[PDB]
Ligand binder design. Structure first.
Ligand SMILES: [Cl-]
Lengths: 168, 164
């Protein structure tokens, strides 16, 4: 179908250097690409800004050389200078996934209450069980993303106060 | 009412929360006398010391003032352990002017807090914007967030799996 040999070559070849992506894994299957859509339906290439609190779609193209049961396809985000502020996967969602040979598309959505700033997106593909975890394709960092908001808040959590009573 | 700044400074010092090792400072021309927190089910943190990740929380402040004070900033924030604030906001950001009257009054905020499971600290500050610190409470109290839904980091934004 597609040789792991090819997937290994794909993996080594397609590595984003604008973020200094370090990429590892057995490459039995790989994250061929990730495309991110905003609520208005536009991409990051089309508009690289995400509004704080916007619903985002993560469109994964997964390319597998063979079938692989019980995988974990995860994604996370860190501040341009720091550790992860957000991370999740199908495992956290309680949703099992099995990869089939050839291309396949897995789609996640999330509403991201993240304050304005520059962040990094990471994603990872691994096999959960049968012995210990097996990393298939870990992409770190995969891409940059900037959040913007109508008004500025403290920290990273976008949770604006509602004023119920101002003693007025 | 008839409360003096002298009285408020005394209250400020003796009602500092020792459990959290609270540091408290400011002129105390007005003070944050109390903060009661309600969860979306109507229960207080005192009744049920636990907030569900992502739920709507109500902050019921009781403020004591020794005199009328215009252009007030009442801020709240949260942090984890020895870290900096992970969330913060105030009436100023929200675009709501506050003027304190003499005596006791209430200021009430809501926020929907997508904070992952863990132990956090709540900080609050009262000041007159130009800043004169009136009453800064760091940390005022502990708060525990929980969810059966587990995530990484502090941001509770669970993925939904659309297409497998
Ligand atoms: Cl309470």
């Amino acid at each position: 179908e597609v040789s792991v040999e090819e997937l290994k070559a794909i993996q080594l070849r397609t590595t984003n250097e604008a973020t200094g992506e370090k990429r590892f894994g057995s490459a039995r299957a790989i994250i061929e690409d990730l495309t991110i859509y905003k609520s208005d339906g536009t991409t990051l290439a089309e508009k690289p800004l995400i509004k704080s609190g916007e619903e985002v779609t993560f469109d994964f193209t997964i390319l597998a050389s063979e079938e692989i049961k019980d995988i974990a396809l995860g994604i996370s985000m860190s501040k341009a200078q720091g550790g992860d502020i957000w991370g999740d996967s199908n495992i956290g969602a309680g949703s099992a996934i099995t990869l089939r040979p050839g291309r396949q598309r897995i789609v996640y959505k999330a509403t991201l209450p993240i304050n304005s700033g520059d962040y990094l997106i990471h994603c990872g593909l691994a096999k959960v069980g049968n012995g210990d975890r097996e990393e298939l394709d870990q992409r770190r960092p995969m891409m940059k993303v900037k959040f913007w908001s109508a008004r500025e808040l403290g920290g990273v959590i976008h949770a604006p106060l509602k004023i119920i009573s101002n003693g007025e």
